[PDB]
Amino acid sequence: ADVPIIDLQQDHLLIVQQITKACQDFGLFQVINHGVPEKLMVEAMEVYKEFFALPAEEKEKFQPKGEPAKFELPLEQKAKLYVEGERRCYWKDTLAHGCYPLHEELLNSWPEKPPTYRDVIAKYSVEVRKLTMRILDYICEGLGLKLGYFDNELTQIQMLLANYYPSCPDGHYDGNLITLLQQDLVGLQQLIVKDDKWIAVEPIPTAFVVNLGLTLKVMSNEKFEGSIHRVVTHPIRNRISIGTLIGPDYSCTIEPIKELISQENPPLYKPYPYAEFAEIYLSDKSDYDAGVKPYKINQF
Ligand SMILES: CN1[C@@H]2CC[C@H]1C[C@@H](OC(=O)[C@H](CO)c1ccccc1)C2
Ligand SMILES: O=C(O)CNC(=O)C(=O)O
Ligand code: NA
Ligand code: NI
Ligand SMILES: [Sr+2]
16 A cells, blocks of 8 residues: 555546645555556567667667766766666666657657667657646645646656666665656565655556656655655566656756745755756765755754
């Protein structure tokens, strides 16, 4: 029950109530009957299976200056293969690119092999964004904000991170606003902070896992939780997951949503530049919320 599964074809008010409770209590939930075509979800996963099976000489096309990219600024939207962290038996290869707006220069950075990549992944990205914006509107209703509150610079960046985890038999907040993750194998765990317990997020191949980022934790003034989650390498399979990470542009200023502040809900963060946060978030792993620690105020 600590990972709620929310049916998006229930009554609207029940959806709002269930999403709001999940956001307050956990910061992570799954959605089913969510309106994204299952056929397209299957096709996207098949595209990534094909992509990660390509020979090394194809992979080199995504290695800037001959080596994988790192998650560091500037974080370009053009498609690259990234590595992140070290684990010994890379433990994670990620193909990442922006998706929105889909400028010609951005699209022409995407893979051309496998040949269906651009058609499938463009359609997938449009559908996942539409679902994300629906979820953000349910969140607006739960917070008491007008519909469309997040339909601006706060959602300007849509990074697709397709992750490949080589098998081996022997945690973070996402820094952005909100993430949708498609998975088909065990490996994702969520931290239940109140119980200091890591628990599995059941793989439902036709669902999306929704997790709130550190930006939404700040903007909600901690009325919502951000999700701290981690991945366990599979002992048998090479696991692939598909994340759509939506959030602000690098030129944005972030602060607790001003309309929700009150005498009993004073701001817990001062305004900060997203780019400055992003540098710390990507560099400083000393604590899960290191990226926002410099901006905390009104602590008691
Ligand atoms: C597992 N890691 C974590 C989460 C995904 C992956 C890569 C990195 O996160 C990002 O690169 C995202 C891209 O939007 C980001 C970058 C700067 C600011 C806010 C968010 C850290
Ligand atoms: O791959 C997964 O199951 C989870 N991925 C992430 O949390 C991430 O890339 O930020
Ligand atoms: Na393997
Ligand atoms: Ni994550
Ligand atoms: Sr539909």
